[PDB]
Amino acid sequence: VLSFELLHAPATVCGPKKSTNLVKNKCVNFNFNGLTGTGVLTESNKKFLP
């Protein structure tokens, strides 16, 4: 018996999984981590902080 809980506490056990491939140089919809937009994706030389 796997018992869930419904209360005012944040969810601990999660994980949406899901997977689709990546394309480039084509106008396409993206939903990386909640953010959504339309455009083309190209390689960029800018360096991010870790």
Binding site: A9, P10, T12, L49
Partner: protein, 49 residues
């Protein structure tokens, strides 16, 4: 002695979803137990720099 005149940003380390209620604050230190201050915690206690 004293904090030097300078600037330095602080980078995140961890994020905790614990969500408990926090109200009080205390700090731990290292206690030197040896022959100088033997016995129980009543006498075996030093400050240190």
């Amino acid at each position: 002695r004293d904090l030097p005149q300078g600037f330095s940003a602080l980078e995140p380390l961890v994020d905790l979803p614990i969500g408990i209620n926090i109200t009080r604050f205390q700090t731990l230190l290292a206690l030197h137990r040896s022959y100088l201050t033997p016995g129980d915690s009543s006498s075996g206690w030093t400050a240190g720099a």
